[PDB]
Nucleic acid binder design. Structure first.
Ligand SMILES: Nc1ncnc2c1ncn2[C@@H]1O[C@H](COP(=O)(O)OP(=O)(O)O)[C@@H](O)[C@H]1O
Ligand SMILES: [Mg+2]
Ligand SMILES: [Zn+2]
Length: 628
RNA sequence: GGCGCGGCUUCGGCCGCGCC
């Protein structure tokens, strides 16, 4: 929409000269505009009586929509036809002819992947230009790389057939698991080879101009020491062991109700354990599961508390708990809750003692405080964003600030104007000169007690430098030499790809059995299992329908050719294991099951085999026929 | 349901972000 910056002009040059190029430029510097310039040029270069055809790949839906609107709006004067296909722009719309009848097409990559496989789009020769957004994803088995495997099979396999020009956009080509500066460079050449790029476009002549429009904060690291003696954790942990023991009383097999393993009190993974346990027990069986929901609620609160105590001050954790229980005994208040609240009360005074103890303060907070003093002394006109781990840590930090004499110059608020200069939050849901990551996940401070976090961070910094040095070096090579290297890397990768064919599994045609992984009851047999479109597995017969119950899906999805309309579970007395889903498929109401919800058992022997994915299950897979 | 990519892994997986 607005007038091109000089670096944008510079970045679009190699592409406009027809070269396959990767445009590597910082986020928000305007690569999409560069792609608009390249696209405009590409379509305009064709003499009257010919046409180009441009395809643009967005890896995600929001990007897809944004660029559909942007490319549509930009190309109105030109009169070019602009449409796009997403997983929703389906399915009774003939894709081949949508490509025939358009000039610019925005695709999610999987769509091209599918139609290429199904033969409905015979060749990428239908395109004259392919633009890959987030092009650093063009590796391994990713959709981008499937598309490029098709390209390269056409280029190398000698089936010509003109090929389209290929350009990619990224903010970072990356280096992978490179340890030295030569492994990094080799990875980069591998990326170029995947995309058939012979040119990497970086800003070289307008650096000092690009610099002015880019958020590149000064990155700082302060490792902070965790609390020396912590007796708050010990007490709360004992409460959690207690209530877990209570929850096991109404649910014997509690330790096996969740897939999540080796939970630790006061961690995020414990929270995740909570969530999976609660979605496994849905509110006669409602009584057991409701009680279970109570226990796991209190366990959730305790987990929260531990985390608060870890990163804020024990007073904050204990306040949080006190308020929670004040809520419980003011909107409850049946036996289990009275019992739980009492068990808390029996420890309340010791917790109370341990909290107000000077030895039990958090030095981490002193560190953060210090950073705030210094920075607001160097510039009191400073706007800060303070990232914390949990919702509760937001409030803990806010109270801590409002009640800290040394920070009486900060007017805080959570997610302006006469007084809000620091905002505490969890996710970003740019105008802030000071960014602080206080135990999370222009200046930027990372504060953590975890040396591993810092280690990884310094590793990523070093990687960035290896990447930049490597690109710089690459760009000095004559294009011919580089194309020759690219050629032979591509030849090599192609050989590996074709040599490492499957081969077809050859099935064990013997009848095996299928039981609910949880309660081991008879679900069905393998001879009763049909495959729908290569990848989906259903079961035949009414005898199977007595073994599952249906229950409306939280989020109905319209995927491929199916219509997910229900979640399905075991029918037993309070198993209710997640078996899979129920779909409307074409005209049929059928169940679709996942192999991870079943134990396979050999009928003759009794041994039990376990399978994560149907890909790994090698049985006489009978193709599904409707009239049965 | 299935696929892809990441982070951990007791290599049994677990989790996260996406896509069809
Ligand atoms: N030359 C320019 N002058 C002013 N604003 C621009 C210019 N180029 C891009 N912008 C704006 O800045 C934003 C950059 O976004 P985008 O180009 O998609 O960034 P990225 O290339 O990192 O994805 C765009 O939304 C655009 O509206
Ligand atoms: Mg972009
Ligand atoms: Zn069951």
């Amino acid at each position: 929409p607005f007038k091109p910056r000089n670096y944008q002009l510079e970045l679009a040059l190699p592409a406009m000269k027809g070269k396959n190029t990767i445009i590597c430029a910082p986020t928000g510097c305007g690569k999409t505009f560069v792609s608009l310039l390249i696209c405009e040029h590409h379509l305009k270069k064709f003499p009257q009586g010919q046409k180009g055809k441009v395809v643009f790949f967005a890896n995600q839906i929001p990007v897809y929509e944004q660029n559909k609107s942007v490319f549509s709006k930009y190309f109105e004067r030109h009169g070019y036809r602009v449409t796009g296909i997403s997983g929703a722009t389906a399915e009774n719309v003939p894709v081949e002819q949508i490509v025939e009848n358009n000039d610019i097409i925005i695709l999610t990559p999987q769509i091209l992947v599918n139609n290429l496989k199904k033969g409905t789009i015979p060749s990428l020769s239908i395109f004259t230009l392919m633009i890959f957004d987030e092009c650093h994803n063009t590796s391994k088995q990713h959709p981008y790389n499937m598309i490029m495997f098709n390209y390269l099979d056409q280029k190398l396999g000698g089936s010509s057939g003109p090929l389209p020009q290929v350009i990619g956009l990224t903010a970072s080509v990356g280096v992978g698991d490179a340890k030295n500066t030569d492994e990094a460079l080799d990875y980069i050449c591998k990326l170029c080879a995947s995309l058939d790029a012979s040119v990497i476009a970086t800003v070289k002549h307008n650096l000092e101009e690009l610099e002015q429009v880019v958020y590149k904060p000064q990155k700082f690291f302060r490792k902070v020491e965790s609390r020396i003696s912590d007796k708050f954790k010990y007490i709360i942990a004992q409460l959690m062991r207690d209530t877990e023991s209570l929850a096991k009383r109404i649910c014997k097999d509690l330790e096996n109700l969740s897939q999540i393993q080796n939970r630790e009190f006061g961690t995020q993974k414990y929270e995740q354990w909570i969530v999976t346990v609660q979605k496994a027990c849905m509110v006669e069986e409602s009584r057991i599961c409701k009680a279970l929901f109570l226990y796991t609620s209190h366990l959730r609160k305790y987990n929260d508390a531990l985390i608060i105590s870890e990163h804020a001050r024990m007073k904050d954790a204990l306040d949080y708990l006190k308020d929670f229980f004040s809520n419980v005994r003011a909107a409850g208040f049946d036996e289990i809750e009275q019992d739980l609240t009492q068990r808390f009360e029996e420890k309340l005074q010791e917790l109370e003692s341990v909290s107000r103890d000077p030895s039990n303060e958090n030095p981490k907070l002193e560190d953060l405080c210090f950073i705030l003093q210094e920075e607001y002394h160097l510039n009191p006109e400073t706007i800060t964003i303070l990232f914390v781990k949990t919702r509760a840590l937001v409030d803990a930090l806010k109270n801590w600030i409002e009640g800290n004499p040394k920070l009486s110059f900060l007017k805080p608020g959570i997610l302006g104007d006469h007084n809000i200069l620091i905002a505490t939050s969890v996710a970003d849901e740019a105008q802030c000169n000071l960014v602080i990551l206080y135990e999370y996940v222009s200046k930027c401070f990372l504060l953590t007690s975890n040396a591993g976090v810092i280690e990884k961070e310094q590793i990523n910094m070093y990687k960035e430098k290896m990447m930049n040095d490597s690109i710089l070096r690459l760009q000095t090579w004559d294009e011919a030499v580089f194309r020759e290297k690219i050629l032979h890397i591509q030849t090599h990768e192609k050989f590996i790809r074709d040599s490492q064919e499957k081969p077809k599994p050859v099935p064990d045609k013997e009848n095996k059995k299928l039981l609910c992984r949880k309660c081991k009851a008879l679900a069905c047999y393998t001879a009763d299992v049909r495959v729908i479109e290569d990848c989906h597995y259903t079961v035949l017969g009414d005898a199977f329908k007595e073994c599952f119950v249906s229950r409306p899906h939280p989020k109905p999805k319209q995927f491929s050719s199916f219509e997910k309309r229900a979640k399905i579970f075991c029918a037993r007395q309070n198993c209710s294991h997640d078996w899979g889903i129920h779909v409307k498929y074409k005209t049929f109401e059928i169940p679709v099951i996942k192999i991870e919800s079943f134990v396979v058992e050999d009928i003759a022997t009794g041994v039990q085999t376990l399978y994560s994915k149907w890909k790994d299950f090698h049985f006489e897979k009978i193709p599904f026929d409707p009239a049965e």
